[PDB]
Amino acid sequence: MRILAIDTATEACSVALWNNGTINAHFELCEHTQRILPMVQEILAASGASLNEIDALAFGRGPGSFTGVRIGIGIAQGLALGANLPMIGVSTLATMAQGAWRKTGATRVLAAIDARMGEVYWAEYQRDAQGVWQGEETEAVLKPERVGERLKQLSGEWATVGTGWSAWPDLAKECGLTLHDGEVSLPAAEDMLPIASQKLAAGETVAVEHAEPVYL
Amino acid sequence: MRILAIDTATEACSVALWNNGTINAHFELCEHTQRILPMVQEILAASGASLNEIDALAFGRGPGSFTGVRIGIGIAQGLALGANLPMIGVSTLATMAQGAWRKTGATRVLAAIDARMGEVYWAEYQRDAQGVWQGEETEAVLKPERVGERLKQLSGEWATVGTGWSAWPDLAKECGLTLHDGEVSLPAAEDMLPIASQKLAAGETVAVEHAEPVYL
């Protein structure tokens, strides 16, 4: 089964294709559109796959750039609609947590995105025994001050991901947790795949008209 | 044969479907994306048509909002790629001229778009005997002053279209031409269809990777 993933939620622009484990992905910094179509077409030609054949299109539902996310979803809805494909919304936070697992093996992650105007998109994600990232209900838009306040309520060791940490260097400083560097600052489509894969298996897909950015 | 047209080149956002003359269109002022997909899906359900069945997707290639045009094209490329559809680029200027013909019958049109920072997208379009708008080579980005300069070189009666005239009220004032009001200020997808129809008949389509905004 195949899954095409696209993301434009943050400063990064990426596309990836899942084909029974085998992955074809493209990543780069970005205009959040002029590069997507060529990437999509690049990946499809590379893997020698047709949009019509794919089983589902995974889209970056954010949170991230208010404009960035909406653009990626629009193109994703177009690609999926013209090919009668189910869509799967993947969290930008969870996506990065998957990235930390891949690069460091971290199973507990604190995701913090440096949102504009001194705001931070926050999430506490913990991978369970089935390999599923738990904690989606913890996603939120917070003030740096409120985050450091949260940290004091957590315990154990965690890996950190997101631009939020570099933006607010004292967060990891003043907390009594054991923090490890998740080595992931921005989301990658290749990381959305594993998560999309499991959601597809659980049948958590949405029709094109229901694909929307997450609201926090 | 069916043709789906979408445009987001200017402040207006519209979609239309051509089915052997019969047309289903939607028009409104606009975020240049949150409304497109629903419109597309609205039109498809209304006419009871499937993307896969359509014969070609017409896109507004501009000139217009640098950002607006690129967004519409991206979604159009997605819809067309997922459905293996040929694409047809339709000029925003010619589109409005078609609009003047529809509302007033004008066969000679002077299109002027009020571009930002005191600039104007200009075009002289004249409908020939076959019903084809001639003058595409006259499209250009000009300074108000250069436009009024051009006008003095034209002759006969013309209909005016575009936001450019209201932005620069002296253009139609100082010229010795016989100008009629084209009654069209912004482009409508429904007007792209006739033009797309003829280009399709002439085989002037482009592959998804070749759909790009016009550069003037």
UniProtKB/Swiss-Prot annotation, chains A, B:
Compartments, record wording: Cytoplasm
Database matches in InterPro entries: ATPase_NBD, Gcp-like_dom, T6A_TsaB
One BP annotation, GO: tRNA threonylcarbamoyladenosine modification
Designated name of the protein: tRNA threonylcarbamoyladenosine biosynthesis protein TsaB
Cellular component, GO annotation: cytosol
Protein family according to the UniProt entry: Belongs to the KAE1 / TsaD family. TsaB subfamily.
Coiled-coil intervals: none
Disulfide bonds: none
Keywords noted in UniProt: Cytoplasm, tRNA processing
Pfam family, one: TsaD
Described function: Required for the formation of a threonylcarbamoyl group on adenosine at position 37 (t(6)A37) in tRNAs that read codons beginning with adenine. Is involved in the transfer of the threonylcarbamoyl moiety of threonylcarbamoyl-AMP (TC-AMP) to the N6 group of A37, together with TsaD and TsaE; this reaction does not require ATP in vitro. TsaB seems to play an indirect role in the t(6)A biosynthesis pathway, possibly in regulating the core enzymatic function of TsaD. Neither binds polyphosphates nor a wide range of nucleotides on its own. Does not show O-sialoglycoprotein endopeptidase activity.
Keyword Endoplasmic reticulum belongs to the record: no
Highest rank taxon of the organism: Bacteria
